[PDB]
Ligand SMILES: [Ca+2]
């Protein structure tokens with residue numbers, strides 16, 4: 001059961017990074033956890049630097065909030081920005097300085113697929129408003145795996161494609177009429193693209209929505225606060241039905257309300 005986003009709030013900090021190297025990054029959980037993982041398994045990637053490859057893995061939420069990682073994966077390839085997601089036992093991330101999406105099976109630590117997103121800009125071409133090499137933004141919702149980006153053909157407007165979680169083949173593609181660079185970030189809920197924009201570093205709003213079903217968009221005003229004033233990523237988890245975000249060394253979640 002899905003619905004339309006009508007509310008965002010109740011930001012909760014779950015974990016503060018140990019060092020300044022965790023100023024920004026991406027943390028997430030698997031909406032469709034596979035053995036030996038569960039709905040509590042938590043992955044954390046500090047992305048401060050040029051050589052990002054370590055992936056902290058926590059078995060329990062108590063472990064994630066208090067103790068140490070159960071395991072540390074070393075990615076064969078370097079990771080770009082904060083747009084990665086975990087889905088069905090695999091990490092989906094962007095190859096550094098490339099337009100290549102990579103499926104990395106966590107349990108076997110094996111690369112299952114590599115796929116350039118056709119015509120997509122990368123490494124500074126189409127980042128979100130605050131920049132940060134955020135050209136390519138992966139997403140998981142109730143329908144599965146998506147990728148958010150832009151192309152020259154789309155004239156810098158946000159483009160979203162439904163991805164095959166197995167071989168990363170583009171199944172469907174939608175062109176919007178909103179510039180990706182005019183927006184702070186984005187996520188997908190029940191097949192609906194939502195964008196986030198900032199009046200300030202602490203003040204944010206969900207300002208736009210595009211339904212891939214109907215094909216029509218809306219302007220919106222759904223305010224929420226960036227408590228620590230430097231958000232580097234915000235994704236949606238279709239299982240917990242919350243927003244996961246990274247804000248100035250803090251790994252936070254937002255609760256939401258769907259109509
Ligand atoms: Ca996002």
Ligand code: NA
Pocket residue numbers: 082083084085137138139234235
């Ligand atoms: Na993402």
